[PDB]
Amino acid sequence: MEAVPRMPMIWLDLKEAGDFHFQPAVKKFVLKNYGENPEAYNEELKKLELLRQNAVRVPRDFEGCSVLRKYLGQLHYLQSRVPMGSGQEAAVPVTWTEIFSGKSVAHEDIKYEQACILYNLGALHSMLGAMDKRVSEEGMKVSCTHFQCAAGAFAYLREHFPQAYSVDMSRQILTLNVNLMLGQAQECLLEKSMLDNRKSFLVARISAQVVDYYKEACRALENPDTASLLGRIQKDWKKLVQMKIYYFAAVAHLHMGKQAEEQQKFGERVAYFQSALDKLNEAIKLAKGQPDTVQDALRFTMDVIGGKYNSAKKDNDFIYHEAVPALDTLQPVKGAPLVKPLPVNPTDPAVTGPDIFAKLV
Amino acid sequence: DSYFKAAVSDLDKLLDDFEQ
């Protein structure tokens, strides 16, 4: 449907993995504590190594998400049987590349490996959400769900790994990531609600919530430490987000004006369409340099809003003669949040399959 | 992947109930 903006979306890159030489530590622990032949679990160790190699070179598709979840769970199964966390007997170095600086960061802690895999699960879902062109209802809903899965991964990471192993996984950066992913999920839902031709007040409330998520992301992007860490990524993200704040505020007030039209509140219709046009004009100024995908969405929306405002003001001036309310006298549009971080269970046997180390006890 | 499809399907119901 031509009423769908189909703006481009932000995604997060996957982190690069270094070494995690767990095999010698597991073998030493088996002989020292469990008292068994340290070579008795070579088949299990080979399975986990192959799984890691697949996880750190993950295919960029839905199957890759299942690989990361499976490996994440098997790491939980290993940690429950062999103590490889911070300060524990079988801990070995884990090295991953911090994505914004490109520098290697090492911790002797299996939960660092878990954290990075969980991060990459969120990053991969964000890529799969952003890759779709969102031409069909199914593409919109699948992208929406990918962004909710991304938020869920980043939210789980933030809550259960609360001491950041590296600055790309800090609490404030993960909060930025969750809010961006929820804003993008809500934007995809908005597109579906316009494709479905839902009621104007619902479209307005859904779009108002897109604005609220992006306002929260924008505040995080203005944080000096986030800006310094992300560098030019912060400049790029902030330009897109700031433009979308005004664009989806324009869409919200366009649909409030349509609700006013449906209720024969013809003075209120002028006020909302005027506001919508002013917001769209700001979005256009903020969109300088953006790709033609952005410019086309703005241009098509200007066709709609510019014409409806002129028609509404002419109708009120010469036919209906209703008072045009000042913007501040009307009740603001309250967002309708209909997306959420989808819950993660790292040890769900449906996603982990059988425990690789079931024999080790 | 079955969990994913349920979340996708829920979106239809969320809008229907919200729209009333």
Numbering used by the authors:
A (entry chain A): 1 to 361
B (entry chain B): 2 to 21
What does the paper say about this structure?
His domain protein tyrosine phosphatase (HD-PTP/PTPN23) is a tumor suppressor that regulates mitogenic receptor downregulation, endocytic recycling, and cell migration (Chen et al., 2012, Doyotte et al., 2008, Kharitidi et al., 2015, Lee et al., 2007, Ma et al., 2015, Manteghi et al., 2016). Crystallographic structures of the HD-PTPBro1 domain in complex with the relevant binding regions of SARA, endofin, and all three human CHMP4 isoforms reveal that SARA and endofin binding is similar to that of CHMP4 at the conserved site, but critically extends into a neighboring specific pocket unique to HD-PTP. Altogether, this study identifies the Bro1 domain of HD-PTP as a highly selective interaction hub that coordinates recruitment of endosomal signaling adaptors versus MVB sorting and receptor degradation.
We then demonstrated by biosensor binding experiments that the first 22 residues of endofin, bound to HD-PTPBro1 and HD-PTPBro1-CC with similar high affinity (dissociation constant KD 3.1 ± 0.1 μM and 2.7 ± 0.1 μM, respectively), suggesting that the endofin binding site is in the Bro1 domain of HD-PTP. As predicted, the 22-mer SARA/endofin peptides form amphipathic α helices in their complexes with HD-PTPBro1. The SARA/endofin-HD-PTPBro1 binding interface is largely hydrophobic and involves residues F5, A9/V9, L12, L16, and F19 present in both peptides. Leu16 accommodates itself into the second hydrophobic pocket and interacts with L202/I206 in the endofin-HD-PTPBro1 complex and I206 in the SARA-HD-PTPBro1 complex, consistent with the importance of these residues for SARA/endofin binding to HD-PTP. The crystal structures explain the impaired binding to HD-PTPBro1 shown by L15P and L15E mutants of endofin. Substitution by Glu would disrupt these interactions and also clash with L338, whereas substitution by Pro may cause a disruption of the helical structure and potentially result in the loss of several interactions at either side. Indeed, a shorter endofin peptide lacking 1-MDSYF-5 showed poor binding (>1.5 mM) to HD-PTPBro1 or HD-PTPBro1-CC, confirming the importance of the Y4 and F5 interactions.
